[PDB]
Subunit: 180 residues, 6 copies
């Protein structure tokens, strides 16, 4: 089995911190992200096995109750999505550069995961948050054809749901773009 990712979005820092406590305790899950985002959201991201993430997410929904804004689970998430989120992808020689930008963290996770699952790309970074808009984004590289079809796929779902801000493929990025 591959791991799952779970997300709870909460209206309060206070409640978000209590929800995070519940989520960590509920089952064997690792914390990826617990932080205040755009006003005045608090988000919790965790990863573990399918069933472990499901208990953890229910636990947080239980504690947070009416201040839950969103909860989401993506089973069989691509390993690179997790490392990217945890600001931990190794230095990658960037070739062609793709960027997907969505209105919600859930749609971003879906897009990043779909992107990574198609062909030969490496995710470069994921930005949940980040002060503010609520806009999140993923960047990736590979040869131009690989990147092109990876962002087109990464975008299919998000666009249908009106969650997609925009995307770009930049084939030969200027060096002040590799000066990330």
């Amino acid at each position: 089995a591959m791991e799952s990712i779970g997300l709870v979005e909460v209206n309060s820092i206070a409640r978000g911190i209590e929800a995070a406590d519940a989520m960590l305790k509920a089952a064997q899950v690792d914390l990826l992200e617990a932080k205040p985002v755009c006003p005045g959201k608090y988000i919790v991201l965790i990863c573990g096995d399918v069933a472990a993430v499901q208990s953890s997410v229910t636990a947080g929904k239980t504690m947070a109750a009416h201040s839950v804004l969103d909860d989401f689970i993506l089973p069989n998430v691509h390993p690179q999505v997790l490392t990217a989120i945890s600001a931990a992808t190794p230095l990658t020689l960037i070739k062609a550069l793709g960027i997907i930008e969505t209105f919600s963290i859930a749609s971003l996770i879906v897009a990043a995961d779909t992107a990574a699952k198609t062909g030969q790309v490496d995710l470069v970074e994921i930005r949940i948050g980040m002060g503010i808009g609520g806009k999140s984004f993923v960047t990736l590289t590979g040869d131009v054809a690989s990147v092109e079809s990876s962002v087109a796929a990464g975008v299919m779902l998000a666009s249908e749901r009106g969650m997609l801000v925009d995307k770009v493929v930049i084939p030969s990025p200027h060096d002040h773009l590799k000066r990330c």
Copy 2:
């Protein structure tokens, strides 16, 4: 005599900086905080004796005039409120964890001060600001009963005025919550 705390909130950075200059000059007061908060507020927090804080606050209200959004004074403020604000509370062994979160800096000061004044807690941190919402919060620890009755008291006033976002008491915080 115990010290007082004074707050001026201003619509401009420019005016806020001029107001802060007036406030520092007006009387023997110390500056706790002078910073831009949520759009596009500038806040000034100062502390000194009752009468000194009163002159300082009037001075700022004088300079800032129509771009004042709020001015506030809390006499006989608990020493821990001040150290907490000035990001200066020593490392405290966190036992049970209480958090109060309010819509305004004034209501937060009142809540933190009332919390500290009731029983045996230590305030852990205060966050004015902080990008954004305008939401502020206080965290504190102690044994569970002490914390429970300290946040209930800290909350009484704020809730009546519709300034209270929320609160939590977490009796046995997970270690990734002591990883503050």
Copy 3:
């Protein structure tokens, strides 16, 4: 010839990054600033010769298309505006302190440039952005008369266009204002 400054404001990070790539490639220009500002804008600032900046700005407008929020060019910009923007003005003994604060980056550039062009002041800093409001500001020093007439001039244009938040001249700034 003195250099020009060009600005493109874009609705997406993704598009903003693609626009920046186009702008750098279009002609011999230097990048001053490329960054996400208030929700969910991305801004690009560049400098070079008149004609070089014009090509660069058209290039970005070309790539960014309907997600352009603003594009602007200021020819014969004062050298101090550029160094101030690039967070690079040397330590300056601050005498009298002037601050201009505007609702748009364009109006700020105009105001800073007009300020620097009048009499004997040194710009101290420029803040584009900066989380959030969209409010930008310039600070400058000199003797009191020089600063007074430099901000009055720096403000003329901005005020007529309803782009001016406010300004202050502080003749003898308190030392916790020289503690910038």
Copy 4:
């Protein structure tokens, strides 16, 4: 009773971390500082009551054994020494500026404490460490006569023991020195 301060210096990070664990557990003491300093020292600073600090220091000496380089205790330490060490002295209007610089952390604590105990000064900062030399220093302000006699006293002990690097009193510090 006023509080005491205790210091253990250890040859290893590993041992220093174990010593710190012992020290925190030994008695009701607060941790001020636990950090690697010049090669390859680890230092622990704690504060509490006389007897509590004595148990804590013995505990660390017990765990650290032959990798102890120095242990020290200063009873009835001036409250300002503690706040200064914990990087927590409020913004202070600096008038005349005194600086004492010693070869050892112990001699610095003694000097800072003696300085604070004489007349009307406020300690501004203490730097243990700090990469490297092993040199530590204290800065303080007040009127010129107060500062002059406070550093002369702060220096008496240190100089006799050949632990004193040097000191200065700067009566009217340039503003780029108040730009601390």
Copy 5:
């Protein structure tokens, strides 16, 4: 096949940067670390397949020539050693805490790798460098018996070669040690 790790230590920043350039170019390897350490060393750490790391290391030794201080290769390195080095191990619930500290980066890599290979521990962090001494260290957690036998094994080789500074197992770390 599992990956290998290669290290080149160079006497100059200048030469170290040239060596790093050679190493990256020589074969498909990823850069883990390229940085100045204690005076005036520059270190390069890379990872890839056995043969790729061997070419990369020879390349750096070629460019750096007489300013090479050390070169080292560890085949079949434990995946956790790499993630730990690249400051990228996820938040781990620390139980019992082990620390190994050595005089050389090579001996540290060997010790960390041997530690991770024995029983059920998770490496928490690795510190190459770090200003200064040249001392490096690894921390790990698990239950007490697992950690005890993992550091004893991690230490065997290093101690025989006089490269071992020291080690500790702390069974129940104080919470200000989980405040890492």
Copy 6:
């Protein structure tokens, strides 16, 4: 006239801070750098007109007396040396990459200045200090021939005086070297 650069190196932080105060006061000079470097040096770098820098340097030598380790003045310094030192060179497209590394800050200034004065290069950065060794370095770019003859010239003087650690010209730097 072009500006000069002056350097005073002092044995104490305390004395170095007093020397810096004297230097700033002595004449119309700007402060470039005032900071503790390798154990336990404090360095002051200033720039202004020839005669102004000469007064400033004599002033510091006067205050610092026997704790002066070095004083130096370089007349008609290249504008790029100053901007490079003040961490303020704009983003430069790096082509071929040259690096000069010397044992003393004086020899570095001389080398950087000679480098910039020969042909068409742009200095990229200067690192005085920097923890530790006392080793300083300059990086520059241009086409390969320009860089080659600029570092050869930049090195002539330093090598004769045994102050030169080393240099490199890297014609096609790997992208993780443009990831500066």
